[PDB]
Amino acid sequence: VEKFNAENYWKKKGLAMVPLKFPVGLGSRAAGQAAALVHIYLDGSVLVT
Amino acid sequence: MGGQEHFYMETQSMLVVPKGEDQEMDVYVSTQFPKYIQDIVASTLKLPA
Numbered sequence: 001v002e003k004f005n006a007e008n009y010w011k012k013k014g015l016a017m018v019p020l021k022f023p024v025g026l027g028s029r030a031a032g033q034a035a036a037l038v039h040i041y042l043d044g045s046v047l048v049t
Numbered sequence: 050m051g052g053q054e055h056f057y058m059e060t061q062s063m064l065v066v067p068k069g070e071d072q073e074m075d076v077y078v079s080t081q082f083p084k085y086i087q088d089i090v091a092s093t094l095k096l097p098a
Contacts, residue, residue, distance in 0.1 A: 041087075045097035 065090075072096055 001013040026032050039047045063078035072094060080086050091098050 041098035042084075043088075043091070043098045 001015050004013045037049050041047070059079055061079065063076065063080075066075045066077070067073065068075065074090060074094065074096075076086055076090055078086055087098055
């Protein structure tokens with residue numbers, strides 16, 4: 001890219017690198033609570049929500 | 050001893066509504082036994098319950 005930019009006046013290249021620390025979590029324990037409901041019918045099939 | 054008509058004032062009545070996804074059917078029916086309706090409809094359609 002440095003080589004290119006030394007040889008080209010009206011077109012330039014660039015490169016960048018950025019790192020990531022992305023934390024995950026909500027404000028309280030209560031905000032992270034979660035629930036489900038599961039049925040098993042007599043033919044063995046399952047309905048979940 | 051003679052027989053007898055049930056003579057419920059609401060006659061036999063139902064509405065069967067396919068959702069259009071995964072062969073899901075919803076059955077709105079005047080019955081005393083929903084689980085049995087679910088079985089005979091699923092069986093008839095060769096679907097899980």
